[PDB]
RNA sequence: GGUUCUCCCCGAAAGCUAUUUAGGUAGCGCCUCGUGAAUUCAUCUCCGGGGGUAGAGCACUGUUUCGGCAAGGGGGUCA
């Protein structure tokens, strides 16, 4: 019976494969468009980054502080 | 610059804002899949609205031509 064994349906999806062929839908570039940055191998920008302009994580101040008793 | 098998369904943008930013990138707009919702939404009819655009006009702010009345201004009679 070790031959007919199945795992459920909708279990797998066999994953993504770029670059295999037209008809395979996502090849040519492989869904990550024509050229710019984010194109690139590598490429992408950090988190938090807008562009340059001041991150929200920089634009807002920091406030309060860490009380250890609050860990105890 | 290149990115390799097939079929079915849906289907964009080239805009705004910011950026040592302008051929990059982030949020939003636009696309896709899933979930949940109200005659929710669109077209038409009727009703209630506020505009100051087209047109027009010259009361006002400017500009423009002609004619009249013509304060006023010059020369001339004077006491």
Redesign the pocket.
């Given at each position: 019976r070790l031959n007919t064994l199945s795992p459920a349906e909708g279990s797998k999806k066999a994953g993504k494969?770029?670059?295999?062929?037209?008809?395979?839908?996502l090849?040519?570039?492989?869904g990550?468009?024509?050229?710019?940055?984010?194109?690139?191998?590598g490429?992408?920008?950090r988190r938090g980054?807008?562009?340059?302009?001041?991150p929200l994580y920089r634009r807002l101040p920091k406030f309060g502080f860490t009380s250890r008793k609050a860990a105890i």
């Open positions: 494969r770029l670059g295999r062929g037209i008809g395979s839908g090849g040519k570039t492989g990550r468009g024509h050229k710019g940055q984010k194109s690139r191998s490429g992408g920008v980054f807008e562009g340059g302009q001041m």
